[PDB]
């Protein structure tokens, strides 16, 4: 399992509110990070998952938690999808494009026979350590509220190590 | 990851309500399964997660869902823990022992440096396909209600393909 | 080179006039095929190259020629682009999605460090034999007219061995 | 076999009279050691062998000999067993936990198919050299008196080289 | 493919307007070069393709483009052929000989079973980066006018990086 | 460990009361066997170990237990040693000679840098399974009485499997 | 060296006064053959070496000997040379093209450096066994008479096996 | 062959006139050496070969020659044999035990399937160079006289290069 | 070593009493053979060793022993040498030539840096088993009489297996 | 082939009328050399090939050309042959022995089948570059005059580099 391992170096292009940016492991150092993987933009499935995260992004940013949704689509497609979907539009966190699949593979989250990333969320702490992993099949939704609970729980354990109960 | 793959064959001894039994992949065929891994019996940490699933067990059972908790302790130790911790005593599902680490490694959930399994829940459908995976570090808890929600979502999708909102 | 070699087996999803279909090497057997590769959907470069080809889709069709545009975008992305751009909307030929990049690599046409196919066109005869290759860097357009000429020329040489 | 070789470095957690401690090869330096391996805590088999060594412990101690029992159970389980089986309660020596199997494998004493250590006693001298090895299948017991005899023989030879009868 | 890659080193004898010159990657430096490969001299194929190029040579020389036609024929042959076909006579550009196929292979353009080059035309920018590639089967002609159109487009792009869509 | 493993095939020459014989794994099948390894004949150390076993050999044969002492010396040396030592003389069990070291290695009991076998005793049951192993350094004696106890214990467990205490 | 070895099979295009023909080793079985390798056609050097061979085609042909000249030039070039050069025009023997360099390499006579064959001549008896090899650098020329002397010797030696002397 | 090659390093225990000592390649440096190998102590073959050599031990000693008999028996076994046989009791030269079989294998003289050295003698000069080899199957004795001759001959050739 | 092993196949030309014969392992069959190797013909070394053998040839021929002297010289050379040295003239046994060293190497007797055989004598019994080996440095002579003594002993042993010590 | 390549270094024993000498490639630097390979000494074939070379030693020596005949026979045999055969006796050029076959193999002229060199002659210029190779089977003989013609051509070609024609 990748639980308790340090994330690997990466460099991708992303679409963050209006423009294109470059994201690397450097950007994550010192912060808490959520890497939200999903299969593909413009598919027929409602972007509820990405939208719920979007709804709680102000709260996440309070907690000092950066969000990076990731898929193998290009940042170009993210821009087009962003400015064409009610839900996707709400997103203010960076939308990473991973066409080489390297980031997706870094997190061993590639559906190799489809070239698409699996539905997985990774919580990474300031030191780069993965502290929570969640992966679900199509249809089984990922709850933003539960994600927030885990992040708070993880943030607490980092402040109060060895909390017997 | 192991999402959407079929579970591997396995044979372990377990403690289930007062007696010892053997559990293999055959026991999961045709049912919905929850494999709940944890690090170790008898530690100073709170058996919250285990008692949690225990509370929702009657409910999971009404959904045709079996539960197997797993750690690298033997089945003998589970029998001891079950008859010692009140939280653990509420358990009526099979408590699988995995001293060789095979079951744990089948699910790629082993902390090799400690010989203990990581905190991780797996939802397996009737055809043995892994539909949901959850792993967390020590101190980050697993919500049994969020689990139940995922199980029902998984059953709904199995029963009603194509109803994902457009 | 890949000139005068046989195309390899492939299976991809594509968007073709409002619907999603599957295309494989078996659909090219017995027909003349054009595999038109480009780097990406929704970029800012003018989609002139793919428009050109749409304009001549009837010529190629009368000539027994099938057109397949290929990018490493998914077929979902193609469907969407087919609505954003007026140019892309002319396209009646199949738009193949290649996220696994296998079809692209078969044609040794992958920019590995970008995960995007290069600007390359392949003309394939009914036996799956590559008879013409054209590849250009960004900015250097491809003329749909020169492609028609080469295709007629290929069809001619197959039915008039000699020169 | 491992006869006359030096023990390997190790670091395990153990239960010793009510509290948890850490044991490494450093703890054995300058002393005489008995590493007593067994398969598992809490089984239906008789803890005869363990209670046996317990009885001779005060005696072994008067010979400057330490005792470490070992199994692939965790130290937490040993603490539970110690406060549950009366035979085990007599134990005052360190009960080493070896869930990764490293200590067990260092002594080449692992049943790989069961993730449990074989019944085997090792006598290690002050320089860490293995002087006596005893391994037996289940049901064949280890005599603590024969052990003591071997320990004293080993000490006598260490103190009086060349006195083997001609 | 070879697109967007830098040409590899090379040393070839050629024939240019009566005299025998030598060419290397050095001469391509800072310049725009066109490598026009063809199978063989003295065949019965219409020498028309090379003629089209010759007919546009003045126009290309104006654009600052050097042309090297290449066959695995010796530069000696190019000489005798340049004075046999009235079409070939028009050629003012260098006619490289590649009897070792080394230049041909640098461009992955050798028909290994024939020992002859394939009908391929390459456009190399001032930095040595291949910017246009064209290969055809025996019989499908190459349009010298399309070659020009692309050489111009290449240069325009070299000077107007990121030419967004007006 | 070799505990609970089947012995390997072998073929050695031995000296058994007066003459030379050939012993193979075949000879052990169906019987209980004790393979008693020792470093070397004619050394200066008293053959107490071999003699105690000799003293209990009548009892061992009652229990249907065959004995094979083994060392890397040749059967020739065993004969000479046998007819030249009070203690060794008592021996009526086969004295295997293992100059190629193969048998010794089969039981992973070779002191490679000395070419001599280590002081180890192996109890092997009728099916060829090693049920008890004992190895001691020079000076630490091996007790025949304790060996007999183990053999009886092993013979019992084979008759009464899973004897809870 | 290749002396006393059988020629490897081949298939090359050739020019034989007017007609293009396909030559193989099958064409050489039964006859005495001469493979006259040379650097290239249309060179500024003296086509003397080749012309001289023609001067003896009479006799050679009488002797049941065929001549296959070989260069890594294509048969197309041989044709254009044959009818563009006086001496080359005298040639009535097959002019092989070896643009792949395979025939040349079977005769281990390639200037890997230039992609041209070296000045070498080979005498092959009816069984395909090389009986005489001759290789010289640029400048040292081959002598047609000396070649014929050998062929005669070769033919004779064959008639009376092992000619003691 | 091993003829004219240098003996390899070795370290073995030996029995020599009532006591146990160690012998290594360093003890042969500077002297002439004879390595006399035989299969085994206490067998039934007549120990004539080793007796022969004992008889000439004084000749060889006056000649600056050291004798080392070698078998894969231990030095303890040699000490014992030195008392059983009257013949073996004449031996004053060192009897080397080779249970690890390394010295024997150095001389490529091991019957692997028996773990016994073959009947072979090696004459080694002061530089460790093998100047004479003699090996025979069981039953074919080795004459101590022929060995002396060869040794004198070797000593001669080393001090009179030519012939 | 090579002792007690069966000789390998071989095909060599030789010289025996004026005529050139061929020898193979076939001829050694059922017979007792002696392979007498030496470095080279026509040197300044005393041809004495080969002479001793010749002097005992009649006695050996009586015992049913065939002798083959071997040098990596051609059988041609053996001929010319057999008629130059008055010692060599006495030779009635076959003089094998081994210019390919194949026979010499079969016996691991080649001085690789010299292309010449070492001074070695081999005794092969009727079954092809090497029964006696002798090799010496240039200068140390081989006694033909000791050779005889051993050939006799070999045969006696071949007929009296297990000749215990009377 | 070895045409136009430099000779590999060597060290062999030779016979030069009376004296035994050591020849190496160091002896060939600066001079024009001829290596005359042949099968063997004392054969029943005609020593004609070698004798003829002697017949021209006059001239060759004039031309600053040395002659090294080579066979895989030892220099001892060459001596016994030189003074036991009329024609062989005419030889004033160095007679090399190559019993290891190394010199022969540097010239890729060995009958691995027989352990004898093939009938081959090599012309080496002062820089050690082979300029002419000639190999023939048993029976086809080499011509001394033809050899001299080449050497002269070779020497000349050297004087006026690239002799256009
Ligand atoms: Na465990």
From Swiss-Prot, chains A, F, G, J:
Pfam family, one: 1-cysPrx_C
Catalytic activity: a hydroperoxide + NADH + H(+) = an alcohol + NAD(+) + H2O
PROSITE patterns associated with the record: THIOREDOXIN_2
Organism superkingdom: Bacteria
Enzyme Commission number: 1.11.1.26
Class of the enzyme per the UniProt entry, highest EC level: oxidoreductase
Active-site residues (renumbered): 46
Keywords noted in UniProt: Antioxidant, Cytoplasm, Disulfide bond, Oxidoreductase, Peroxidase, Redox-active center
All copies of domain Thioredoxin, residue ranges: 1-156
One Gene Ontology CC term in the entry: cytosol
Annotated GO MF terms: NADH-dependent peroxiredoxin activity; thioredoxin peroxidase activity
Cell location: Cytoplasm
Function according to Swiss-Prot or TrEMBL: Thiol-specific peroxidase that catalyzes the reduction of hydrogen peroxide and organic hydroperoxides to water and alcohols, respectively. Plays a role in cell protection against oxidative stress by detoxifying peroxides.
Family: Belongs to the peroxiredoxin family. AhpC/Prx1 subfamily.
Subunit architecture: Homodimer; disulfide-linked, upon oxidation. 5 homodimers assemble to form a ring-like decamer.
NCBIfam families found in the cross-reference section: AhpC (TIGR03137)
Miscellaneous comment as given in the Swiss-Prot or TrEMBL entry: The active site is a conserved redox-active cysteine residue, the peroxidatic cysteine (C(P)), which makes the nucleophilic attack on the peroxide substrate. The peroxide oxidizes the C(P)-SH to cysteine sulfenic acid (C(P)-SOH), which then reacts with another cysteine residue, the resolving cysteine (C(R)), to form a disulfide bridge. The disulfide is subsequently reduced by an appropriate electron donor to complete the catalytic cycle. In this typical 2-Cys peroxiredoxin, C(R) is provided by the other dimeric subunit to form an intersubunit disulfide.
Protein's UniProt name: Alkyl hydroperoxide reductase C
Organism: Salmonella typhimurium (strain LT2 / SGSC1412 / ATCC 700720)
Phylogenetic classification of the source organism: Bacteria, Pseudomonadati, Pseudomonadota, Gammaproteobacteria, Enterobacterales
From Swiss-Prot, chains C, H:
Short name of one Pfam family: AhpC-TSA
Gene it is expressed from: ahpC
Name of the featured protein: Alkyl hydroperoxide reductase C
Organism: Salmonella typhimurium (strain LT2 / SGSC1412 / ATCC 700720)
Keyword terms of this UniProt record: Antioxidant, Cytoplasm, Disulfide bond, Oxidoreductase, Peroxidase, Redox-active center
Subunit and partners: Homodimer; disulfide-linked, upon oxidation. 5 homodimers assemble to form a ring-like decamer.
EC number: 1.11.1.26
Alphabetized InterPro entries for the sequence: AhpC (IPR017559), AhpC/TSA (IPR000866), Peroxiredoxin (IPR050217), Peroxiredoxin_AhpC-typ (IPR024706), Peroxiredoxin_C (IPR019479), Thioredoxin-like_sf (IPR036249), Thioredoxin_domain (IPR013766)
Catalytic activity: a hydroperoxide + NADH + H(+) = an alcohol + NAD(+) + H2O
One Gene Ontology cellular component: cytosol
Cell compartment(s), UniProt: Cytoplasm
CDD domains per UniProt: PRX_Typ2cys (cd03015)
Extra remark beyond the main annotation: The active site is a conserved redox-active cysteine residue, the peroxidatic cysteine (C(P)), which makes the nucleophilic attack on the peroxide substrate. The peroxide oxidizes the C(P)-SH to cysteine sulfenic acid (C(P)-SOH), which then reacts with another cysteine residue, the resolving cysteine (C(R)), to form a disulfide bridge. The disulfide is subsequently reduced by an appropriate electron donor to complete the catalytic cycle. In this typical 2-Cys peroxiredoxin, C(R) is provided by the other dimeric subunit to form an intersubunit disulfide.
Recorded family membership: Belongs to the peroxiredoxin family. AhpC/Prx1 subfamily.
Main location class: cytoplasm
Function: Thiol-specific peroxidase that catalyzes the reduction of hydrogen peroxide and organic hydroperoxides to water and alcohols, respectively. Plays a role in cell protection against oxidative stress by detoxifying peroxides.
Location of the Thioredoxin domain: 1-156
MF term (GO), any: NADH-dependent peroxiredoxin activity
Enzyme class: oxidoreductase
Active site, per annotation: 46 (cysteine sulfenic acid (-soh) intermediate)
GO biological process, one term: cell redox homeostasis
